[PDB]
Design a protein around this ligand. Structure first.
Ligand SMILES: C=C1[C@H](COP(=O)(O)OP(=O)(O)OP(=O)(O)O)[C@@H](O)C[C@@H]1n1cnc2c(=O)nc(N)[nH]c21
Ligand SMILES: OC[C@H]1O[C@@](CO)(O[C@H]2O[C@H](CO)[C@@H](O)[C@H](O)[C@H]2O)[C@@H](O)[C@@H]1O
Ligand SMILES: [Mg+2]
Lengths: 407, 551
DNA sequence: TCGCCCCCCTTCGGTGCTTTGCACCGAAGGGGGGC
């Protein structure tokens, strides 16, 4: 019973037309049970094929909350949706979030279902539930309310969210709240138990009008390391020179003329070559240029974030986040702790959620990922491990590791 | 009939079609006048006049019955101007996805599209004029009041209508399985035959109130049921008979037909192969070009012919048992698989033979096969099977720890069915003590076409070969080829080509490139090879010297 | 002389790279099958 906010696509762009991929039995059953109730409650309506748009649908379970959560992959719809920096409905990002001891993520997407969506925009939200062995044609719905996963919903609901949170933030001025899509990121410098208690006060505050625990305090940077030995092969020095030559695209004033000269001639790779005093000075020089962060690298909010990941083995994953090439805003090392150690695709899917989560905390948005995996291998399995209510942009790269740069 | 109409639009800024009708005859347009008089009496079509400015041509073909005719209108022009639709048919039901049912019925709706009304505002665009007599006089004109056969919106709007009509019966009868494919209804239940038939009568009556007849001619009550190109027996299912062309002289188009039939056969006939027959299609230039069968293609064809003469059947799905998928390697990037739950009782078979990428290996293609089967299993049964794979656990372990991209296979157990999938060589992680060290380099001139490949070694050996009609990347591969050719069973190679290192490090065992194939063959014969990279033009080590020389 | 759907095999053409050809990938040609 609210006036709708008029919404448009970007000029010269049509709505999404993305095919539904196959779903397992239990995801299909969960979706039909979820969508039947949503239909009864008027949140979605059954539509026909004269609607030419579609967006893929699937479902996830977070391991702590074992009820299914419907997830519509509105990435295509969001790229074509008008920006809301123009209607002054965008959300600023608080720089204090990343300096908190603990940050808890809450899924508040259900709040959107109380605000209707522009009559003329709902056709762009259509999705299709598949059927096992194609017993029936797909079943089609569209939204009548602000959907979960649509970039417009936090923008339109924002004035409402501010009002609901104003008392809590008033009473807790040192707690930091940042909304990103369907999520609230809740940071505090408080001991673990009392943090969780104010989390629950938060919760009941929300429930009244209408938890996954981070420690950014303990994210670290993993710089480039140069091996340390006392005897050095020709092969070691070749490996060392190629690494430093690459790092000179990133760091300033890194030299290889002293180490390179040690390799005059055509030598056996296993020949041990003693280091001249000068070469030892050049390497100690290089070593501590790599010690400390690069000078001249600043976040630009008008450019996209990009993330690269390299598989390093034994469950270790290195990553860099940047906007311009070789100007890394962050370099890191993800390591999983599940002990099972068996699944590359699961580890990479979890590495992606963690990296994207860090970017949300730090900069307020997720990066576009360059994924070290075949397209078809990622697409066979990734939804089995996804636990976020958002989905980042990604693309698939096959880049062999020339130097083992980041490990 | 009393269904609510589905509103439809032309694409923005577009008008309706304005073409002309064809070959204009006494026989043809008196047959035309007869054809439509009964449709008009049914209300399916209405006479129109010249203030309707649109037109489209019409024709007819024979039905599967093959005394009946099928009215068709060449709506190609109208279709391009009609709004797009989101198609609700997402796939094709498969008999291996059916569970055993106590009582089964197959029904079909009569004159299905003609029972669904067309948007009143859109009808004027379906105009077809049937001329007067061989273009003497003004001409007879009709428009559709119902879904036309040939219009791109018709199948979607029919399916959507059929779904709405069935919905009350489905929710009311959730223990009755109804496969709905276009106007074809498979109905299975675990009720006794007498109750089953009572539920069918109810369903037929419900369809009839909504204007969908179910004529007795297409009402199947007894096995074997003819369904979706198959025969459904109580315990098993067969494909309807596949007849392969038996030409003495083969055109390209003949070969294309044959490969298609074999692919269709491969869903239940194990071990079908089409690589050699498909090879004959490459580089050809006309569908009527005669193509002589190679010896390999004749052998492949004879092998499949043997397979096809044996009768086969699939069984039905039992949800309380596991799905199992077993894969065998057939050579030249061909794979074949069977899916079963009890041994020697296949639900279905299949094959994977796609060549993805210029350079690859058997482990990657096995991984691809696994992914194809995983996708199809989810489509058909809603879950992934357990895999039986002809690859050792050590081999797989060796692969996913060295290979830099993330990769994975779900729960699988080794099955010893040679030939097994294996890595054919593995690059050393450290330089080999006592092995010669080759510094290789190749360069080509972009304009020239001309290049050089050569090496320089720590044992004083050196060599340069001139190359014509080459590229920069080829001379680098060529340089590596040369070192492998001239070196012992253990060798250390240092290149400045990220490109060449990239291909070789992925351990390919096959390639569309003859040069890369030769390198692979050389790598397989070596005992140990360490391959290292250095940046070019940095005056490094032996790299500078070999660089020196190919200039 | 038609429509819509799935599948496979081949060919073509757009994209982006610290490239100058190469690898990747989507679309469209042919075929099979369904209604
Ligand atoms: C699936 C379809 C319905 C049921 O297919 P159907 O074989 O049962 O035909 P229908 O029920 O009408 O007559 P019936 O009384 O003998 O059952 C038909 O309406 C129309 C559609 N269809 C089928 N084939 C063709 C075709 O080639 N070209 C076109 N444009 N459309 C076709
Ligand atoms: O993985 C790419 C694959 O996913 C689809 C959805 O089926 O596209 C999604 O992912 C892309 C990569 O970020 C987005 O650009 C796109 O908007 C989103 O729908 C397929 O389109 C694509 O093949
Ligand atoms: Mg029919």
């Amino acid at each position: 019973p609210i006036e709708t906010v008029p919404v448009k696509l970007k000029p010269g762009m049509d709505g999404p037309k993305v095919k539904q991929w196959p779903l397992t039995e239990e995801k299909i059953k969960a979706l039909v049970e979820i969508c039947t109730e949503m239909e009864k409650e008027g949140k979605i309506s059954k539509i026909g094929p004269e609607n030419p748009y579609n967006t893929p649908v699937f479902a996830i379970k977070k391991k702590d909350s074992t009820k299914w959560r419907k997830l519509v992959d509105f990435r295509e719809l969001n790229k074509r949706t008008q920006d809301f920096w123009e209607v002054q409905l965008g959300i600023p990002h608080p720089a204090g979030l990343k300096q908190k001891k603990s940050v808890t993520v809450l899924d508040v997407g259900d709040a959107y279902f109380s605000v209707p969506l522009d009559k003329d925009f709902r056709k762009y939200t259509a999705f299709t539930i598949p059927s096992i062995n194609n017993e029936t044609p797909g079943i089609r719905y569209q939204y009548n309310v602000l959907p979960q996963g649509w970039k417009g919903s936090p923008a339109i609901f924002q004035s409402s969210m501010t009002k609901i949170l104003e008392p809590f933030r008033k009473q807790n001025p040192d707690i930091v709240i940042y909304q990103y899509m369907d999520d609230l990121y809740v940071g505090s410098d408080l001991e673990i138990g009392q943090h969780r208690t104010k989390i629950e006060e938060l919760r009941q505050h929300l429930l009244r009008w209408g938890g996954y625990e981070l420690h950014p305090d303990k994210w670290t940077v993993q710089p480039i390391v140069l091996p340390e030995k006392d005897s050095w092969t020709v092969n070691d020095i070749q490996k060392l020179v190629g690494k430093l030559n690459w790092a000179s695209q990133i760091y300033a004033g890194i030299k290889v003329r002293q180490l390179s000269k040690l390799l005059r001639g055509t030598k056996a790779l296993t020949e041990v070559v003693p280091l001249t005093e000068e070469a030892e000075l050049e390497l100690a020089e290089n070593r501590e240029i790599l010690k400390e962060p690069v000078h001249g690298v600043y976040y630009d909010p008008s450019k996209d974030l990009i993330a690269e990941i390299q598989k390093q083995g034994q469950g270790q994953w290195t990553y860099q986040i940047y906007q311009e090439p070789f100007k890394n805003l962050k370099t890191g090392k993800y390591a999983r702790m599940k002990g099972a150690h068996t699944n590359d695709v699961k580890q990479l899917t979890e590495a992606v959620q963690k990296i994207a989560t860090e970017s949300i905390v730090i900069w307020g948005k997720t990066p576009k990922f360059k994924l070290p995996i075949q397209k078809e291998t990622w697409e066979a399995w990734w939804t089995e491990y996804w636990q976020a209510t958002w989905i980042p942009e990604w693309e698939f790269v096959n880049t062999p590791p020339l130097v083992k740069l980041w490990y | 009939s009393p269904i609510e109409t589905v509103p439809v639009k032309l694409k923005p800024g577009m008008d309706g079609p304005k073409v002309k009708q064809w070959p204009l005859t006494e026989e043809k347009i008196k047959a035309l006048v007869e054809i439509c008089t009964e449709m008009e009496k049914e209300g399916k079509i209405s006479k129109i006049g010249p203030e309707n400015p649109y037109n489209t041509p019409v024709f007819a073909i024979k039905k599967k019955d093959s005394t009946k005719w099928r009215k068709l209108v060449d709506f190609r022009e109208l279709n391009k101007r009609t709004q797009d639709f989101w198609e609700v048919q997402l796939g094709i039901p498969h008999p291996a996805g059916l569970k055993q049912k106590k009582s089964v019925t197959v029904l079909d709706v009569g004159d299905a599209y003609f029972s669904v009304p067309l948007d009143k505002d859109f009808r004027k665009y379906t105009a077809f004029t049937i001329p007067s007599i061989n273009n003497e006089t003004p001409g007879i004109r009709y428009q559709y009041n119902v879904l036309p056969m040939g219009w791109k919106g018709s199948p979607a709007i029919f399916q959507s209508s059929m779904t709405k009509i069935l919905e009350p019966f489905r929710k009311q009868n959730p223990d009755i399985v109804i496969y709905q494919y276009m106007d074809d209804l498979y109905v299975g239940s675990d009720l006794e035959i007498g109750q089953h038939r009572t539920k069918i009568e109810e369903l037929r009556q419900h369809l009839l109130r909504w204007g969908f007849t179910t004529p007795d001619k297409k009402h199947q009550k007894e096995p074997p049921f003819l369904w979706m190109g198959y025969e459904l027996h109580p315990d098993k299912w067969t494909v309807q008979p596949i007849v392969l062309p038996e030409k003495d002289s083969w055109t390209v188009n003949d070969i294309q037909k044959l490969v298609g039939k074999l692919n269709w056969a491969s869903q239940i006939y194990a071990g079908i192969k089409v690589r050699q027959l498909s090879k004959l299609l490459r580089g050809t230039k006309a569908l009527t070009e005669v193509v002589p069968l190679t010896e390999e293609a004749e052998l492949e064809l004879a092998e499949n012919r043997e397979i096809l003469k044996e009768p086969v059947h699939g069984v039905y799905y039992d949800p309380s048992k596991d799905l199992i998928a077993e894969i065998q390697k057939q050579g030249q990037g061909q794979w074949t698989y069977q899916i079963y739950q009890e041994p020697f009782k296949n639900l279905k078979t299949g094959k994977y033979a796609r060549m993805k990428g210029a350079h690859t290996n058997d482990v990657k293609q096995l991984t691809e096969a696994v992914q194809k089967i995983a996708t199809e299993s989810i489509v058909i049964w809603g879950k992934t099977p357990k895999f039986k794979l002809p690859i050792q656990k050590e081999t797989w372990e060796a692969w996913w720890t060295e290979y830099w991209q993330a990769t994975w296979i779900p729960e699988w157990e080794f099955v010893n069915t040679p030939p097994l999938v294996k890595l054919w060589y593995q690059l050393e992680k450290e330089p080999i003590i006592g092995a010669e060290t080759f510094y290789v380099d190749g360069a080509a001139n972009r304009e020239t076409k001309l290049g050089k490949a050569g090496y320089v070694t720590d044992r004083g050996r050196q060599k340069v070969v001139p190359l014509t009609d080459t590229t920069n990347q080829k001379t680098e591969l060529q340089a590596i080829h040369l070192a492998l050719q001239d070196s012992g069973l253990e060798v250390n190679i240092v290149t400045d080509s990220q490109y060449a290192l990239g291909i070789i490090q992925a351990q390919p065992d096959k390639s569309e490139s003859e040069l890369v194939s030769q390198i692979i063959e050389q790598l397989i014969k070596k005992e140990k090879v360490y391959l290292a990279w250095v940046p070019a033009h940095k005056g490094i080590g032996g790299n500078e010297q070999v660089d020196k020389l190919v200039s």
